[PDB]
Amino acid sequence: KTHVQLSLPVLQVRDVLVRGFGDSVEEVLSEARQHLKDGTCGLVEVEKGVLPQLEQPYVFIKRSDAAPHGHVMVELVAELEGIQYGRSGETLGVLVPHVGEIPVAYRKVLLRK
């Protein structure tokens, strides 16, 4: 399938134990997709002071469309030193590994895989 319905655990930035997916734009996008597939991916909602607490490169989920079965359609965009790789809509949050942190909510998304 080109798209997959996922329910992403929303984590508080100060709870996150593993604060990025790796060391290159290509690696973080790769790892993010693997974790999304394995159900081991969390979402941090971006506000003032969140991103500097996480590790670059960042992986964003961004709205790709204006929501089948409650699931907002999203795609992945990476960022490193203020350059983005991809072009998409509004940020829903930054993806991080989920290693058992207790979430505050779930974000239902339809991921272009």
Side-chain angles (χ1 to χ4, degrees), residues 1-112:
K1 281 188 198 312
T2 67
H3 284 77
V4 56
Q5 282 181 348
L6 304 168
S7 280
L8 296 188
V10 177
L11 308 182
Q12 305 198 316
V13 70
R14 293 187 187 279
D15 285 339
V16 171
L17 295 182
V18 185
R19 283 173 184 268
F21 282 114
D23 296 341
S24 70
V25 164
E26 289 162 277
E27 184 176 18
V28 299
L29 282 168
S30 185
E31 284 293 329
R33 287 183 167 100
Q34 191 64 50
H35 280 84
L36 280 164
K37 175 233 169 98
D38 295 348
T40 61
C41 190
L43 178 67
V44 184
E45 292 184 323
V46 177
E47 288 176 6
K48 291 301 201 294
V50 167
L51 280 181
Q53 294 186 70
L54 298 175
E55 288 172 352
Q56 300 193 49
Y58 310 128
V59 176
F60 299 109
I61 50 156
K62 283 174 166 302
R63 191 189 214 97
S64 57
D65 196 348
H69 315 266
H71 292 253
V72 176
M73 300 195 43
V74 302
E75 59 197 333
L76 300 188
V77 172
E79 182 186 308
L80 178 58
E81 292 152 354
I83 306 176
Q84 291 197 339
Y85 298 86
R87 160 173 221 279
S88 193
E90 190 193 1
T91 296
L92 278 72
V94 49
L95 297 188
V96 293
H98 184 217
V99 298
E101 300 93 334
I102 306 304
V104 292
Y106 287 91
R107 196 69 208 256
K108 294 183 297 176
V109 306
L110 194 51
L111 170 70
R112 192 175 301 168

Coordinates of all heavy atoms in Angstrom, one line a residue, residues 51-84:
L51 N 12.7 22.1 19.6 CA 13.7 21.6 18.7 C 15.1 21.6 19.2 O 15.9 20.7 18.9 CB 13.6 22.3 17.3 CG 12.4 21.8 16.4 CD1 12.4 22.6 15.1 CD2 12.5 20.3 16.2
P52 N 15.6 22.7 19.9 CA 17.0 22.7 20.4 C 17.2 21.6 21.5 O 18.4 21.3 21.8 CB 17.2 24.1 21.0 CG 16.0 24.9 20.5 CD 14.9 23.9 20.2
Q53 N 16.1 20.9 22.0 CA 16.3 19.8 23.0 C 16.4 18.5 22.2 O 16.6 17.4 22.8 CB 15.1 19.8 23.9 CG 15.1 21.0 24.8 CD 14.0 20.9 25.9 OE1 14.1 20.0 26.8 NE2 13.0 21.7 25.7
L54 N 16.2 18.5 20.9 CA 16.3 17.3 20.0 C 17.6 17.4 19.2 O 18.2 18.4 19.2 CB 15.0 17.1 19.2 CG 13.8 17.0 20.1 CD1 12.5 17.0 19.2 CD2 13.9 15.7 20.9
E55 N 17.9 16.2 18.6 CA 19.2 16.1 17.8 C 18.8 16.2 16.3 O 17.9 15.6 15.8 CB 19.8 14.7 18.1 CG 20.4 14.6 19.5 CD 20.8 13.2 19.9 OE1 20.5 12.3 19.1 OE2 21.4 13.1 20.9
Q56 N 19.6 17.1 15.6 CA 19.6 17.1 14.1 C 20.4 16.0 13.5 O 21.3 15.5 14.2 CB 20.2 18.4 13.6 CG 19.5 19.7 14.1 CD 20.0 20.9 13.4 OE1 20.0 20.9 12.1 NE2 20.4 21.9 14.1
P57 N 20.1 15.5 12.3 CA 19.0 16.0 11.5 C 17.6 15.7 12.1 O 17.5 14.6 12.7 CB 19.1 15.3 10.2 CG 20.5 14.7 10.1 CD 20.9 14.5 11.6
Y58 N 16.6 16.6 12.0 CA 15.2 16.4 12.4 C 14.5 15.7 11.3 O 14.8 15.9 10.1 CB 14.5 17.7 12.7 CG 15.1 18.6 13.6 CD1 15.3 19.9 13.3 CD2 15.6 18.2 14.9 CE1 15.9 20.8 14.1 CE2 16.2 19.1 15.7 CZ 16.4 20.4 15.4 OH 17.0 21.3 16.2
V59 N 13.5 14.8 11.7 CA 12.4 14.3 10.8 C 11.1 14.9 11.2 O 10.7 14.6 12.3 CB 12.4 12.8 10.7 CG1 11.3 12.4 9.8 CG2 13.7 12.2 10.2
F60 N 10.4 15.6 10.3 CA 9.1 16.2 10.5 C 8.1 15.3 9.8 O 8.3 14.8 8.7 CB 9.0 17.6 10.0 CG 9.9 18.6 10.7 CD1 11.0 19.1 10.1 CD2 9.7 18.9 12.0 CE1 11.9 20.0 10.7 CE2 10.6 19.8 12.7 CZ 11.7 20.3 12.0
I61 N 6.9 15.1 10.4 CA 5.7 14.8 9.7 C 4.9 16.1 9.4 O 4.8 17.0 10.3 CB 4.7 13.8 10.3 CG1 4.4 14.1 11.7 CG2 5.3 12.4 10.1 CD1 3.1 13.4 12.2
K62 N 4.5 16.3 8.1 CA 3.9 17.5 7.5 C 2.6 17.1 6.8 O 2.6 16.0 6.2 CB 4.9 18.2 6.6 CG 5.9 19.0 7.4 CD 7.0 19.6 6.5 CE 7.9 20.6 7.3 NZ 7.0 21.8 7.7
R63 N 1.6 17.9 6.9 CA 0.2 17.6 6.3 C 0.4 17.6 4.8 O 1.0 18.6 4.2 CB -0.8 18.7 6.7 CG -2.2 18.3 6.3 CD -3.2 19.4 6.6 NE -4.5 18.8 7.0 CZ -4.9 18.7 8.2 NH1 -4.2 19.1 9.2 NH2 -6.1 18.1 8.5
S64 N 0.0 16.6 4.1 CA 0.2 16.4 2.6 C -1.1 16.7 1.9 O -1.0 16.7 0.6 CB 0.8 15.1 2.2 OG 0.0 14.0 2.7
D65 N -2.2 17.0 2.6 CA -3.5 17.1 2.0 C -4.5 17.7 3.0 O -4.3 17.5 4.2 CB -4.0 15.7 1.6 CG -5.2 15.6 0.6 OD1 -5.9 16.6 0.5 OD2 -5.4 14.5 0.1
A66 N -5.6 18.4 2.6 CA -6.7 19.1 3.4 C -8.1 18.4 3.2 O -8.3 17.9 2.1 CB -6.7 20.5 3.0
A67 N -8.8 13.6 5.3 CA -8.4 13.0 6.5 C -9.1 11.6 6.7 O -9.9 11.4 7.6 CB -8.6 13.9 7.7
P68 N -8.8 10.7 5.8 CA -9.6 9.4 5.8 C -9.6 8.7 7.1 O -8.6 8.4 7.7 CB -8.8 8.5 4.8 CG -8.1 9.5 3.9 CD -7.8 10.7 4.8
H69 N -10.9 8.5 7.6 CA -11.2 7.7 8.9 C -10.6 8.4 10.1 O -10.3 7.7 11.1 CB -10.6 6.3 8.7 CG -10.9 5.6 7.4 ND1 -12.0 4.8 7.2 CD2 -10.3 5.6 6.2 CE1 -12.0 4.3 6.0 NE2 -11.0 4.8 5.4
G70 N -10.4 9.7 10.1 CA -9.8 10.6 11.1 C -8.3 10.8 11.0 O -7.7 11.6 11.8
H71 N -7.7 10.1 10.1 CA -6.2 10.0 9.8 C -5.8 11.1 8.9 O -6.0 11.0 7.7 CB -5.8 8.6 9.4 CG -5.9 7.6 10.4 ND1 -4.9 7.0 11.1 CD2 -7.1 7.0 10.9 CE1 -5.3 6.2 12.0 NE2 -6.7 6.1 11.9
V72 N -5.1 12.1 9.4 CA -4.5 13.3 8.6 C -3.4 12.7 7.7 O -2.5 11.9 8.2 CB -3.9 14.4 9.5 CG1 -3.2 15.4 8.6 CG2 -5.0 15.0 10.3
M73 N -3.4 13.0 6.4 CA -2.4 12.5 5.4 C -1.1 13.3 5.6 O -1.2 14.5 5.7 CB -2.9 12.6 4.0 CG -4.1 11.8 3.7 SD -4.4 11.6 1.9 CE -2.8 11.2 1.4
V74 N 0.0 12.6 5.8 CA 1.3 13.3 6.1 C 2.4 12.6 5.3 O 2.2 11.5 4.7 CB 1.7 13.2 7.6 CG1 0.6 13.8 8.5 CG2 1.9 11.7 8.0
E75 N 3.4 13.4 5.1 CA 4.7 12.9 4.5 C 5.9 13.4 5.4 O 5.7 14.3 6.2 CB 4.8 13.3 3.1 CG 4.7 14.8 2.9 CD 4.4 15.1 1.4 OE1 4.7 14.3 0.5 OE2 3.8 16.2 1.2
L76 N 7.0 12.7 5.2 CA 8.3 13.0 5.9 C 9.1 14.1 5.2 O 9.2 14.0 3.9 CB 9.1 11.7 6.0 CG 8.4 10.6 6.7 CD1 9.3 9.4 6.9 CD2 7.8 11.0 8.0
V77 N 9.6 15.0 5.9 CA 10.6 16.1 5.5 C 11.7 16.1 6.6 O 11.4 16.3 7.7 CB 9.9 17.4 5.4 CG1 10.8 18.6 5.1 CG2 8.8 17.3 4.3
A78 N 12.9 16.0 6.1 CA 14.1 16.1 7.1 C 14.7 17.5 7.1 O 14.5 18.3 6.0 CB 15.1 15.1 6.7
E79 N 15.4 17.9 8.1 CA 16.0 19.2 8.2 C 17.4 19.1 8.9 O 17.5 18.3 9.9 CB 15.2 20.2 9.0 CG 15.7 21.6 9.1 CD 14.9 22.5 10.0 OE1 13.7 22.6 9.7 OE2 15.5 23.1 10.9
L80 N 18.4 19.8 8.3 CA 19.8 19.8 8.9 C 20.3 21.2 8.6 O 20.3 21.6 7.4 CB 20.6 18.7 8.2 CG 22.1 18.7 8.6 CD1 22.2 18.5 10.2 CD2 22.9 17.6 7.9
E81 N 20.8 21.9 9.6 CA 21.4 23.3 9.6 C 20.5 24.2 8.7 O 21.0 24.9 7.9 CB 22.8 23.2 9.1 CG 23.7 22.5 10.1 CD 24.9 21.8 9.6 OE1 25.1 21.7 8.4 OE2 25.7 21.3 10.4
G82 N 19.2 24.1 8.9 CA 18.2 25.0 8.3 C 17.9 24.8 6.9 O 17.1 25.6 6.3
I83 N 18.3 23.6 6.3 CA 17.9 23.1 5.0 C 17.0 21.9 5.1 O 17.4 21.0 5.9 CB 19.2 22.9 4.1 CG1 20.1 24.1 4.1 CG2 18.7 22.4 2.7 CD1 21.3 23.9 3.3
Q84 N 15.9 21.9 4.4 CA 14.9 20.9 4.4 C 15.0 20.1 3.2 O 15.3 20.6 2.1 CB 13.5 21.5 4.6 CG 13.3 22.0 6.0 CD 11.8 22.2 6.3 OE1 11.0 22.3 5.5 NE2 11.6 22.4 7.6

